[PDB]
Symmetry: D2
Subunit: 353 residues, 4 copies
């Protein structure tokens, strides 16, 4: 019925905000809108690893299933440039982890259930929102009502909330699709993340736990992605090996081949009156470890710090005059990503021993 914070969306990013607030005393509601290696994985960078540790779920993730990488090798299909480095050259214990998204989500979901100030509502789609001066009024599809000082949108692109607040995102078609799959290679990957640049973007081999398995991200024209998805495994395996310059010898696909579109989503606003948005902007694709849930987790970390400060101070956590501090940080950061000025830093990041 009455909460401080209502989080719309119960994905990794929304759960991370909810888990993050625990200890603050804020009453939080999250409203939802033995298995083999899942096909969707992320390259979890050093800043996300720090967040997950602060949240108390990183060790749960490492114990379930996680693949640590220690080296990086990047080159170009048509020209002579290369970047090659390892954790040791920079005083790191490791560069990052390759982790299944469902593993991360599960760890955060369990933690959320164990958090005394979090209420998870599982059938809880929104029907309406009224943006009152002093509080927000949320009506769920069952007609039940909920009041909040602050609404946090963590539901994908947040189209619905952004529409209600009249702060739309700008969508940008990146004209290429990404094919993903699990590939067994002849040579071991040696816990090195590898990527080759080419005319239709990138081809990355992300090392998994099995010394001879990688999960790939292969960007292609939408047409070529479709061809590669529908090809015989022999055609596919040969095309992949050539695209990867035979770097790990023969390749054998070992999973379904899935394709999804690549897009940018750019925000002129990350907040309004009693509204803050996380996880919905998307800028660069490369470096893979600087984006996806890593960007959303950075959104989450910064929102968490700001709300904890405001709440400490007895301030109204929903007022735009304070939320604009979070927004500014997010916009500055988005700009550095789009300007190409953030990629280098994320590429070379890692965790100290």
């Amino acid at each position: 019925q009455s909460v401080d914070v209502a989080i719309v969306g119960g994905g990794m990013v929304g759960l991370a905000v909810a888990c993050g607030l625990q200890g603050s005393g804020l009453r939080v509601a999250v409203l939802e809108q033995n298995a083999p290696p899942q096909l969707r994985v992320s390259a979890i960078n050093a800043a996300s690893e720090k967040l997950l540790t602060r949240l108390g779920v990183w060790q749960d993730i490492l114990s379930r299933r996680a693949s640590c990488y220690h080296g990086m090798e990047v080159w170009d299909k048509d020209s002579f440039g290369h970047i090659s480095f390892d954790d040791q050259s920079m005083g790191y214990s490791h560069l990052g982890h390759i982790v299944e998204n469902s593993v991360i989500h599960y760890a955060l979901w369990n933690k959320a259930h164990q958090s005394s100030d979090i209420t998870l509502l599982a059938p809880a789609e929104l029907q309406q929102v009224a943006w009152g001066e002093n509080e927000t009024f949320l009506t769920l599809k069952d007609g039940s009502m909920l009041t909040a000082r602050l609404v946090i949108g963590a539901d994908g692109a947040n189209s619905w909330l952004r529409n209600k607040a009249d702060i739309p995102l700008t969508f940008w078609d990146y004209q290429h699709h990404a094919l993903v799959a699990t590939i067994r290679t002849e040579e071991p990957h040696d816990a090195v993340a590898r990527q080759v640049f080419h005319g239709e973007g990138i081809l990355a081999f992300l090392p998994l736990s099995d010394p001879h398995l990688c999960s790939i991200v292969w960007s292609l024209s939408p047409e070529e992605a479709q061809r590669m998805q529908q090809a015989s495994e022999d055609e596919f395996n040969r095309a992949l090996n050539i695209a990867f310059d035979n770097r790990l010898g023969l390749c054998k696909v070992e999973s379904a081949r899935q394709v999804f579109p690549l897009t940018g989503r750019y925000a002129r606003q990350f907040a309004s009156h009693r509204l803050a948005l996380v996880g919905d902007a998307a800028h660069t694709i490369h470096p893979l470890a600087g984006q996806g849930v890593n960007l959303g987790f950075m959104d989450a970390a910064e929102l968490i710090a700001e709300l904890k400060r405001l709440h400490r101070q007895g301030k109204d956590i929903g007022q735009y005059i304070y939320l604009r501090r979070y927004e500014r940080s997010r916009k500055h950061s988005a700009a550095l990503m789009l300007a190409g000025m953030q990629g280098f830093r994320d590429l070379f990041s890692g965790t100290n021993p």
Copy 2:
């Protein structure tokens, strides 16, 4: 009225490049103008050098004033990442040149005057345009008129033309300003382009001809850029040296300090009926050699190639069905830039001896 195949609106570097590039095709072209170490310089990459060589102005540029660089060194203010390489390690004769924009423009402007199929009109601001099915009707402010099969917008962001065709750009504030200036350093730069990444973007030292002068690009918050522009030279020199990790020893600013905003400009369209746009999109700032006039020059090179082809085949160079090939190419390229997938290729680019 005067009748041409192509009317290029804007006589800056990119528009002049298109006009010069078309020479030899037989297309009648009109260019309508709408309006010491020089402080505005570009890092001219290998693809731009190739174009300028095809156009016959590169040797002119080299003879006037140009600074060749052979090495690259990039690092991070807060971490241990670094990229460091030279031309020889990749079979190149050089990586790029630091060139004043005004030198490039003069070289193109002279070449344009020497081109038999180009008419340069100055001043020739536009008052109106009518987009007929078969030709375009251009009215200048003096009331003189011009017909063209195809209009090419090469006038900055092309706001006027884009408004008339109802295909606006999306503007994106990059929340940081760039300070530029000529800096004398204690240590010689050894013809290495250097750049450090930091919390407010980049700081690049672009080597000039004088062994101890660099032109910088220092991105900063708008407030800090203002403070650095207005600081005493001693405060500025000290802040810069620290920002650059003392990499070339003591720094002494030797010119005016100029500041300008960093922005993105994104296009859903690069063409319409009897209209093609060059030089108005802007994506990444880093790498510097991949952007600015380098992006505009690639727009130019691709438009030139497409129009020469269409003209050779007797096709109507103004029909959108044929211009969308050019558009598709620029959009695919825009996408790879914004997605972060093009920067690497441009960072490592260079010129082959042969």
Copy 3:
């Protein structure tokens, strides 16, 4: 497998284009993406009536169910202005008809089945489209393929096609919702359409066949619309009667009360390479007879005329150089609507004897 024209969407507007092309020789595909008085009705104006007659379905509509209105009365809740006129004062046999949308759709659907050059595909959602230079390639969700010289989007707002062609609409929230319902009144309506202007927009009583039934359009704040929808019938009936200045005596609601949002949708483009869009723009709400399916039917009429001309001439009906003629007409018209310069003309329109 191979058609001239593929119409994406089989609603009233898409069917009207398909029926309209009949006689041209164009091969057309339409791909879909004893009952009481339906709650959704339109005020069909004189230009739509002419279209439907040219299409050969108007008499089918009149024989099924249609309500003819002969007079108009408009006034203001707070001030003294009024517009009052009838068909006779202007030499008309009638001003318009109130017709159920499902009746119109049914008539057009039957006509489409009887049209030799139309193929209706009922399970036929789109999966992909490739915009080739010479033709378009449409892949349906069953994986079957279809080629077309021209694609016509007639699927609501056409978000999907507009996204693929990168020509998005601009959405504008009109900040009010419309409540609709069937109302029995004490006084007969005398086949007069009535509307009162008020602080939250309009309240229109559209006369139905039964001399004492009207279908209403009541625009309200989203909150008040919700209140009115959920109110007891007594509260509702009293609120309505007051809002309508008791013009037809006591009111008794006789149907479900439905609410839907009011929005504008503005197009910078109505065509691209091998693509034309109908039925997706939306400008004014008042006059009701100038908008809704009336706007879409005018889109349809103009596209039909242009494609018939092009086809006569042996021209490539998909080339933007020709489609931009249709686009220009649509944009000029949209502008006159938004500028407030078209409403008067539609308000006073009617059919000559």
Copy 4:
């Protein structure tokens, strides 16, 4: 630096109205300027007259030069629809006034100079603004600075301020241009405002003081507007008479013929942190008395009322939580205009005797 409560950017009619309207509140206000029948006139409706009367400049306007109209007659070039009424039929003393914009502006400018809590700064172009949590920092081009609790943008479309706050307008080309001119007619206009609808929009005859002069608004295609602007007076006069169905007999143009574009400007936001915008949105053209400076004057009236209230209650007049009340009102009004639901009310509006 100078310290004020409210800094109004733009010294046009709307900005001056806000400044004058606030007098009596105790708020310190700064206005920063950014830059015969006169040809630009407005149909000043009853709500605008009410505001101008509250501000104490309406009698000044009436004494200088103003044309009162008592009747309205609207019809259609191609059909038999018509609207025809007078003030008396509705209990009004008059419907509206046709007034030169320059007369309204001078009256407001003088009143502004007579207002003890207003400082007019001329010239005072902006160079920069910093949006601090507690106050705004304004830097003028001369380098002088100003702090304000609230910035009010009243400078045309407010592009600069809207860009800085990242809340851009949506621009919409209305595909037609308006030709304006002073026309002498054979028959007297009898203080009736007249308008005919036609295929390219409207043609309005706005009555002036002289019994046989009207100021017109003739919307046309851009091409036809150009042809009418450049035609001989005999061709123009004949075309106009036909377009007006000979309603006032023979027409004789008596001034320059000026053309300008018709456009819409739509706002998703009218406020942000320490920022409120007036006068920059534009929706319908018809009815004429409902739009133009009438829309800006309603923005002003509502902003004035809200700020006086906030100030009376000791609230921070710059916080978005309080400005969103004003915003909500302007957006609801914008919506009703674009939806076609406001025009009727404005068409029939007028002033009560008492």
